Amino acid sequence: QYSPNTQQGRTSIVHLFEWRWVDIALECERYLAPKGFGGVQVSPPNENVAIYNPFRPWWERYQPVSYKLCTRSGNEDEFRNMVTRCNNVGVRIYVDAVINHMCGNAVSAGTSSTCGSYFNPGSRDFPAVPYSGWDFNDGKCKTGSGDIENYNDATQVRDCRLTGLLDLALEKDYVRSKIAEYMNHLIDIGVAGFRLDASKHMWPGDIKAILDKLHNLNSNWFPAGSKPFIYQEVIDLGGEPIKSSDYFGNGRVTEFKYGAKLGTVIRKWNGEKMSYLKNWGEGWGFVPSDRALVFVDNHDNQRGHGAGGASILTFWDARLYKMAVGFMLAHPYGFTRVMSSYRWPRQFQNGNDVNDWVGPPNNNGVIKEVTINPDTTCGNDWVCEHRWRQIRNMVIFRNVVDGQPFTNWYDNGSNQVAFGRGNRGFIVFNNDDWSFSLTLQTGLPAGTYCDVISGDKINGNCTGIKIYVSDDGKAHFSISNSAEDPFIAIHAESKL
Ligand SMILES: C[C@H]1O[C@H](O[C@H]2[C@H](O)[C@@H](O)[C@@H](OC[C@H]3O[C@@H](O)[C@H](O)[C@@H](O)[C@@H]3O)O[C@@H]2CO)[C@H](O)[C@@H](O)[C@@H]1N[C@H]1C=C(CO)[C@@H](O[C@H]2O[C@H](CO)[C@@H](O[C@H]3O[C@H](CO)[C@@H](O)[C@H](O)[C@H]3O)[C@H](O)[C@H]2O)[C@H](O)[C@H]1O
Numbered sequence: 001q002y003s004p005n006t007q008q009g010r011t012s013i014v015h016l017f018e019w020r021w022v023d024i025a026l027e028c029e030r031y032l033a034p035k036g037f038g039g040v041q042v043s044p045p046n047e048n049v050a051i052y053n054p055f056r057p058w059w060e061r062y063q064p065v066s067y068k069l070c071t072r073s074g075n076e077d078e079f080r081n082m083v084t085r086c087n088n089v090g091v092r093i094y095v096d097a098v099i100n101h102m103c104g105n106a107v108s109a110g111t112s113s114t115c116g117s118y119f120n121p122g123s124r125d126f127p128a129v130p131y132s133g134w135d136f137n138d139g140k141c142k143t144g145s146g147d148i149e150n151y152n153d154a155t156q157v158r159d160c161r162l163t164g165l166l167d168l169a170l171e172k173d174y175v176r177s178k179i180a181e182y183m184n185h186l187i188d189i190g191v192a193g194f195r196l197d198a199s200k201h202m203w204p205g206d207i208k209a210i211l212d213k214l215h216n217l218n219s220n221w222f223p224a225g226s227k228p229f230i231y232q233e234v235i236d237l238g239g240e241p242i243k244s245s246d247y248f249g250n251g252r253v254t255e256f257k258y259g260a261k262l263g264t265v266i267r268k269w270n271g272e273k274m275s276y277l278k279n280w281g282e283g284w285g286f287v288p289s290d291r292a293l294v295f296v297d298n299h300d301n302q303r304g305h306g307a308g309g310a311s312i313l314t315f316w317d318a319r320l321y322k323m324a325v326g327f328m329l330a331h332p333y334g335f336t337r338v339m340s341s342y343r344w345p346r347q348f349q350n351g352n353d354v355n356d357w358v359g360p361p362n363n364n365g366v367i368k369e370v371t372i373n374p375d376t377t378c379g380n381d382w383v384c385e386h387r388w389r390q391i392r393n394m395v396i397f398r399n400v401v402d403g404q405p406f407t408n409w410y411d412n413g414s415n416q417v418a419f420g421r422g423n424r425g426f427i428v429f430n431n432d433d434w435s436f437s438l439t440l441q442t443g444l445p446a447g448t449y450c451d452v453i454s455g456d457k458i459n460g461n462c463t464g465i466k467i468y469v470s471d472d473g474k475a476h477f478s479i480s481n482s483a484e485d486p487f488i489a490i491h492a493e494s495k496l
């Protein structure tokens with residue numbers, strides 16, 4: 001299962017955070033497929049609680065009310081339509097699966113759900129599933145408040161409520177079956193895998209029990225015997241009793257130390273410098289590459305929530321952000337996920353953003369459509385990082401060099417480094433406060449190459465910097481510390 005199930009030649013998935021199904025469907029056809037993206041992680045597709053205080057925050061989608069495919073992103077018809085269209089184009093769909101819990105216990109009963117389904121948090125009643133008091137861990141948890149109070153007790157992390165979220169009793173076959181019914185429904189529709197939300201709060205064995213009940217991927221699109229791609233969200237920054245290695249038997253795991261460390265290195269915090277990245281990978285204490293799902297930032301930590309803390313880089317830090325995503329996409333470690341966000345009015349008070357709950361662009365709660373500007377950027381406040389030339393081209397760079405070994409490393413002992421991927425690609429970084437100008441061994445065949453960061457190879461010529469590689473594989477690179485993007489990347493497919 002540890003396989004992404006993407007089409008051979010596509011090495012990344014993009015998280016289109018809070019996008020509408022019809023928009024993702026269009027994007028699959030007009031951009032994702034043509035540009036070589038392997039897949040899309042979609043926000044929870046199941047019915048959630050409609051929260052008006054604050055006004056429709058992004059996190060209301062992590063408070064399930066039922067498993068009906070009915071949310072602000074669209075209905076079941078639109079969802080199935082999106083999966084079909086995307087698949088028929090070679091772009092996979094991965095579902096954000098919230099199976100650990102239902103909504104907050106403090107939520108009011110009624111029908112304030114994205115689909116009118118009736119629910120009653122207080123009496124533990126969710127008739128639309130259905131679920132009742134018998135399906136929650138209320139009696140199982142032993143904390144005085146019923147919530148998770150101590151992360152050093154691996155037992156309450158699993159049996160108690162993560163910040164009040166009603167905890168499902170995943171050891172009961174009935175509950176396991178209603179969750180598998182939900183997931184198989186999605187698999188049969190055509191989804192290629194799942195992000196198991198809050199995997200640290202579930203026992204490795206209960207997860208395994210559910211995965212045993214899952215179908216093989218839709219044979220109309222996937223070869224027989226295909227298993228769904230599973231990546232478990234486990235925030236393991238060391239120090240806790242629960243280790244992400246405990247989950248290797250169920251599938252991959254999100255490596256949160258990846259973005260956190262890369263963040264500090266590129267920001268050059270407390271001594272860190274890029275020259276130290278020569279042995280980036282397991283050498284830094286990360287999980288084995290073949291069990292890693294990596295990223296620079298995610299929906300949680302890009303807004304002071306998840307893990308990484310203050311070192312995390314996001315679109316807000318555009319220049320350093322493109323450099324980290326660039327390094328990630330060039331380096332051989334793990335399977336990469338690209339983030340695509342929307343802008344929100346950050347309002348830092350006392351060093352904290354009081355507007356981090358703000359939901360996606362909307363009009364009276366109705367999510368805005370993604371509009372494409374003439375330069376390919378997006379309107380309506382969608383940042384669309386996946387459409388930034390520097391990022392889009394590095395997505396293609398990863399596809400071109402897939403399989404090539406890590407070689408020809410160079411560093412000045414400070415923050416100017418470079419390395420190639422076999423004889424298929426080469427990348428150079430200048431993160432020092434002074435210019436870089438030197439001739440380096442690239443390992444690429446002779447010729448004139450287009451730098452894919454500053455420009456594009458527009459059949460016959462380049463729109464940006466051009467690099468000339470000699471017969472012995474050497475080439476001169478010059479990067480001012482004043483460049484908009486302090487790094488250059490060239491590959492086999494950008495060769496003139
Ligand atoms: C939010 C996060 O908490 C835990 O992560 C822990 C992690 O285990 C621990 O080692 C450490 O790591 C991380 C690092 O963290 C830094 O900060 C520290 O500085 C570092 O030292 C530390 O190492 O701190 C993290 C955050 O406390 C879970 O283990 C994650 O799985 C979960 N993330 C997923 C799960 C859920 C729940 O469905 C979602 O929550 C989302 O959805 C729920 C439900 O809507 C929202 O809860 C909201 O609704 C509930 C309703 O009851 C209210 O009670 C609550 O106040 C309100 O905010 C929630 O805020 C929202 O993020 C997320 O979007 C989703 O990505």
Ligand SMILES: *[C@@H]1O[C@H](CO)[C@@H](O)[C@H](O)[C@H]1NC(C)=O
Pocket residue numbers: 459460461
């Ligand atoms: C490249 O651009 C130059 C003009 O700057 C033109 O002479 C040349 O024919 C173009 N190459 C191709 C392959 O179109």
Ligand SMILES: [Ca+2]
Pocket residue numbers: 100157158159160167168201202
């Ligand atoms: Ca739990």
Ligand SMILES: [Cl-]
Pocket residue numbers: 195233254298
């Ligand atoms: Cl994640």
